[PDB]
């Protein structure tokens, strides 16, 4: 049915999307797969989904993939490099592009898909956190359909009216009866720990997700709620929402994935299991649905559902991100970059848990750079913020 | 500007819907108001909204109203009788019809609107509980748009995809990725009560609705869960759902009003305040939105949200309703009727709380007439079931 190009096929999101196509072989055809260096995984994916093209970023990995596929008898054409990755995202025949490449490396490929007016299954966070302005403008000009894959943004999308779903980003919320967007989050493992003790929390304590384990980096972001701050930035761009049209709410059980408040008092919400196949399948099948392999949510086996307002004294990173948005893309990409450095430094036990927020603010207070005007400017800000951050860490550890 | 006729304007749903009109005078204009005998209320509504027509089912009430509006310089023309009520629902210029007349009455006025291809703001249980097949077949023929205002059905509607909303009753769930409809209910005040004590519960105890206070009759139906049973029958007709596509869930806090499960695992739900102005406003502005005067729900002042599966030993009436549906409109009509009689008998302390489900079942078992073909047929089944019910109550409240 629909032809897709998967950017970052060997990662977690890429594997989950391939599982969805595996559940619906007659509705989806994989024409191109793009990854980085995981040759072993790529081979298996190429051998199962018969893509016309397979692209590795690393030139060496590509050569290795090539000999592997030939030994296995596959005729999948192998390519290498960023340009090749962008070409796959712009293939004339592809309908959808699952944008799951992490970091700055996902920027150009995602943009190429946007400029080609493809339906974009957006998973890449950096896209809007650092290039929100540039990308939403690009989506408007090409008329590409953005479909948020991230759990929260996807739930919000599903809870939004039809006119906004179509023409996403440049549609008026107020004009479609939407009062605000309710962004939910678990609050992390330190939701009730004495503020006094936050400074002594260990990486292992911080990496225990209150509901289900994830990557260490993301787990820490969930403990500081920087993750929710980043999603706040994305949501603003994605749904064309002002500050007053955004509400952040702690929901410990993570059963409700996010909601939308309406003018008549109605609140629409999306609930489900903690399985990325659900959001992914929603975007791939939109406006229809398909089986994702996810089991039906059992309402009789749930913990009581609760809510609470986030305390900025406990989650300074959340407030930091909200303020950064109002300061511009330079501030948001800098915050994002600084956080990658400080979280990494926390996990490497170079700084304390509470130093993440402190150092993130310190880096931002030293930037004072102009608004990026292109992906190159963003990259420049990113590189600059990381150096400042690495220096901040080093002076702290010494 | 939307032109509307309000069937049963002086009631609770009627006043709430008129309050939505106040908040949006530039979006809605009242053309006709229909009521029964509350002349006092009608006067104020007529003076405030200046309807072109006003009608009272009661001949006398209408007479009095006609003179009061005249002496108070009102241009609204007063009519009377059911025929007039039905005409108001079919006025050519009318766009929407708030079907808020309760009981057997209102069946014909709501059908009139349906046959006229109007947009029906359905706020009347009898329509689908007793005339499910008849009304749904009729909406399919005339292409009338049904918009449920009842809290649960409205929540389900808002949580359904667009293709189903625009072809309500016609479109099928599976094709649109819907696996089931989750109908939620509070469970009543006897949710935790020891099963053996139910027989000694008094009217005052059964009439304590868990969250928001309400009518005695409906409070009792909430305690036996007959209310949810009746809603189950309506939902299957309204959303074209099979038994396996229906799920009944107890949700004590009643914050979530109902939900819908999707093929990919997604569950969509509608939450809000108990205020009926929300659902009413939703249907009136659909596919758009309008301010209803209802303040946003504060998620920080909520009780923990819980869910549970209904135990049929505790809620026999829920099960009776589900079984009645498989038997047709004759059985659902008779069940509804019997329940009116038994609940009223319970309130009058002629029978025990547990005698409601017991007698409801008993009247169903004695019913013979099968599947009505027109509303007149269901009216006949209704009348017959009421009589059988009354005799069962008298037999039990004298002999047994
Ligand atoms: N994990 C989750 O639950 C969610 C993730 N997201 C976001 O969406 C994205 C999904 O990444 P995720 O799957 O989680 O994790 P991974 O980091 O494991 O996936 C990243 C993928 O991108 C590939 N890649 C890395 N660098 C390059 C490059 N330079 N050129 C081309 N491909 C490259 C990797 O290939 P290889 O491994 O072969 O090197 C891998 O397939 C992230 O940006 C994440 O923040 C959003 C919501 C949820
Ligand atoms: N209450 C609620 O929250 C909800 C109710 N519903 C359903 O919708 C309907 C709404 O009734 P509700 O407003 O609650 O309560 P009421 O019984 O107070 O309202 C009924 C209305 O119908 C009028 N009426 C009664 N008999 C006749 C008749 N023979 N001819 C014309 N008009 C007549 C009444 O007029 P008058 O008083 O002047 O005689 C009154 O305006 C009910 O069937 C109910 O089951 C659905 C969802 C919610």
Curated annotation (Swiss-Prot), chain B:
One of its GO terms (molecular function) is identical protein binding. NADPH binds at residues 10-13, 36-38, 124, 126, 215. Gene3D superfamilies: 1.10.1740.10, NAD(P)-binding Rossmann-like Domain. It holds the Pfam family DXP_redisom_C. Pathway: Isoprenoid biosynthesis; isopentenyl diphosphate biosynthesis via DXP pathway; isopentenyl diphosphate from 1-deoxy-D-xylulose 5-phosphate: step 1/6. GO terms for cellular component: Dxr protein complex. It catalyses: 2-C-methyl-D-erythritol 4-phosphate + NADP(+) = 1-deoxy-D-xylulose 5-phosphate + NADPH + H(+). Mn(2+) binds at residues 150, 152, 231. Keywords: Cobalt, Isoprene biosynthesis, Magnesium, Manganese, Metal-binding, NADP, Oxidoreductase. Optimum pH is 7.0-8.5. Disulfide bonds: none annotated. Changing residue 209 to Q: Increase in KM for substrate. Reduces activity 5000-fold. Belongs to the DXR family. Homodimer. This is 1-deoxy-D-xylulose 5-phosphate reductoisomerase. It comes from Escherichia coli (strain K12). The gene is dxr.
